[PDB]
């Protein structure tokens, strides 16, 4: 790695920084608050009796989450189709309005409940928009909505002046004028009543048996977003930098125990350098400090490929109690060298007064010596007078000019 | 860290960063040169002596008092009361920005300062030009007085007065340094500038630099990678332009610090390790001697100055 | 009347925590040492109070003489008007499509004739008895700050804690106070029902977009704020 | 200019020009910093050449460590090498020293050097080379009594 | 002026400039340090007496 970072093959004697030591996260938690005011979908899927088609009901559930677990309502669905959205990705998307419409129709009439359909129901009773974004759930209800004598409580429109608009509701029971005269509002020849009955019986065929249908219309408009919360996750893992996703605040680090008392309505926390150092757990009210995941710099202290190849590995600015003689210094910690207790001359500096060299054998580590020791005898009646002279030479090299370049 | 500062824990950002060029191996090559240069400025002024000298046990130099400049054996950290007062006035791993500690700690610099003090007190100026020669301190003061033109008799006769004046000056220098809290302004300004330059880089990371957000985990989760490449490119450009100017300012400040350290080493060599004939290079007035004192990020020179006073009118021919 | 709000009208700008630091933010705050309207002698007219940038509602009401507040567009027919009515042990927050009278009083239960409400939002009941409130409308969220502090406005410092948020977006330009007394007057037109009760004063002060520098202590409570366009030292 | 058409390849050329200009600006800045450093070093070297080669200086470690005598310059492809000749004392010896000498009730102080003593004897010598000389009036001066 | 040199009399440009970071308060902090330094060089040579 030293030869790679230096782009050479014969590295000299000294210390060289090559890479950086970074601990990778092991797991990854989400923690977002408890799942609370659940919507009531069973109130429309598990209703004692559904409404007619000409008077189909429309329920708006609001600020009520959106847990799409419709499977438990008679899982063997006869028709579970989705328009504009896929089946399961539905459960993890937000929307403004979650309008839910319900009504009862025949088994062979369920095909009319879909975008771009023609017939009696689709045109005169219930019309869906062309670009409808939602789901259509239909299930058999023979046992519930059928009697041996015929259930004539469900009515449907058979005649109308024009086709209904998307999501249009018409309760009008006026006599449909099929002839030329208005009939003065009386049922007779060429003047038929618009609504007709069903008369579901248990002996009817699958095509004529009653089918309870419900539509999930999803609107997303300029307003807030208060539904879609089936969000849930793992337990707190303390003392081990993981990936946390606390209530949208995402990061990587260690969540340690705190002693700073926050405000009751306060959840997040930042330092002076705009760094998240504390977050409140949504499940249980408790503050956890985000400490940065252990990091520093790895450096090779090589004596040079000329002598040998035994090198030492120094992690700077990190205590190596976590992830070859281990020794902790004040500038880091080095592995591969032995702490020798006799001070010699510094050759390869490390930091905080520690130097390394080759004893000749293995890399050593010692406190650098500032020089020799000499204590002169200071007396008020003694002096040191020189006798001989020495003519020495001192070499001082100094640069003057540079290389004149142009671009 | 060129990789972590620009690209937070993102492998695609790391793959995109290598296409910009060799800036990642140059911005870290210049900063390590700055560090190795800073590890040399603290050796041209404090490590001028070869052998460490020590103070004799008898604390009688001839009448003078050097207790405030000599190390105190009571305090575990071997320093002087002046150095202890100076150390208690300089007010000093978050993201890919680390602070490397210096090689020579505050204990070895103190030992070098004590050795220089012992050499300039017991030996005089010979400890900086060859073998150390023992000489009484009053005779060294007579030497330094004759070097500027004043005869040695005024010192050999009025020795008690000079000693009392020097002791009073040494005692009053502590109150003078403690009176003005902005006396160590040159040592706090550099620390404040370094802290500001180190804290302004994290404050600019929150800026979107043109993108929709500032964190990579949001851009890599709201938009698809095939259409989110220009946002990461703009973010990398903005985070590299903020680091290039930081490295440039660091180089300018390192050159300034190197010039200041060269000047300080010249002053230490020409004022502490001997007497100079310059006017205001070793203090305002007639320079006699200089005592060094260490400080967490600098050196304080105490220059002893002989000033004439109580002049009188006379006739000259 | 007209008085000065020296060092009051501050709140928490965002749901973030800090520890003994300084945070400068350009928000919608009440300017310090401003000219607020002290309506203490108006014992039921002039309900024309705008809601351009919000309202700073300060009061020293003795005990339960206030019944709630109303924030509407124009108080006409088929106009979204939110009514926050505070009962003894519960508050009701419904928005109605109804034409409100001059001073709808509560002692009564039905304010107008043709009321038509459509929202559902129930919360904890809200109502030296200073009751500080700050109302605003941003990002489709009718945002309120409430504080109950003991003692007029003193020279102390007390932040306004965000209590309840509710999503609605409308052209809120209405504000009026609902009092409570003994003499029952069902007549909506007659705006004269003065009864011998405690001191009643509804403070009105409009907010302004300003840059505020707040100091967060070790516990995360705003204890100081210096403004930025009122004094050169600030 | 060959894979994509000119009218829509303008942003790529713009980004390339920006990247190639930002890489040259920092190079020019580093060159300016290095040129300032080289200018400071050359000013220091010229001062040393003028104060050490073209004469003798009384500075301690400006013309070499020790006592500077002379300096010889030598050229180099990108610099100058100064060879400083230094006189260093050695083979020192212990002696007895005294400030002055009281004789005839007068305190006599040495003119140059210090009063050296090696046992029941006293001589006058300089402060850089041991040269024992008898205490005469030529190398000594009176400055009052020995009180 | 970091605001006027980059953005000429435009409030939207001023709102967009604050998103770049704290360069506006650093480029003016360095230039005023240059000025205070220049106000000191003329006092170490001429104001020695
Ligand atoms: C979640 O449920 C737990 C256990 O009942 C309760 O202690 C806690 O207060 C709840 N938290 C929220 C946010 O509702
Ligand atoms: C290797 O060591 C030899 C013997 O000491 C020495 O002569 C030579 O210069 C060294 N070479 C390198 C590349 O350090
Ligand atoms: C470094 O490691 C030691 C040994 O375990 C331990 O006391 C602590 O984790 C660290 N020491 C300090 C004070 O940094
Ligand atoms: C050095 O010797 C001292 C005194 O015995 C001892 O305390 C210290 O741990 C030794 N250091 C090593 C392990 O070299
Ligand atoms: C020197 O000064 C210190 C501080 O005033 C004092 O404590 C000490 O006794 C003095 N020593 C002498 C030699 O007078
Ligand atoms: C010398 O005499 C002149 C003229 O009277 C006077 O101005 C000056 O102050 C005197 N100086 C001293 C030192 O007495
Ligand atoms: C406050 O308003 C009143 C009435 O407009 C006016 O008389 C008074 O001078 C104003 N005071 C301030 C603080 O400007
Ligand atoms: C109104 O307050 C009375 C008295 O406490 C209480 O009995 C009644 O239930 C309250 N009505 C609500 C729920 O607002
Ligand atoms: C002089 O004597 C002292 C004390 O014995 C001794 O320490 C010193 O080294 C001697 N010096 C010489 C030059 O003989
Ligand atoms: C010291 O040296 C001088 C000159 O050689 C000589 O006269 C004297 O006798 C010597 N004294 C002793 C006791 O060594």
Author numbering:
A (entry chain C): 298 to 620, 640 to 676, 690 to 736
B (entry chain B): 737 to 828, 854 to 1078
C (entry chain B): 27 to 70, 80 to 142, 157 to 176, 187 to 210, 215 to 297
D (entry chain C): 981 to 1127
E (entry chain A): 737 to 785
Publication excerpt:
The trimeric spike protein is a major membrane surface glycoprotein of SARS-CoV-2 that mediates the binding to the host receptor ACE2 and subsequent viral entry into cells. The matured spike protein contains two subunits: an ACE2-binding S1 subunit and a membrane-fusion S2 subunit. Extensive structures of the spike trimer reveal the open and closed conformations for the three RBDs within the spike trimer, where the open “up” RBD conformation is prerequisite for ACE2 binding. Upon ACE2 binding, the spike trimer undergoes conformational changes to expose the FP motif of the S2 subunit to initiate membrane fusion that allows the release of the viral genome into host cells.
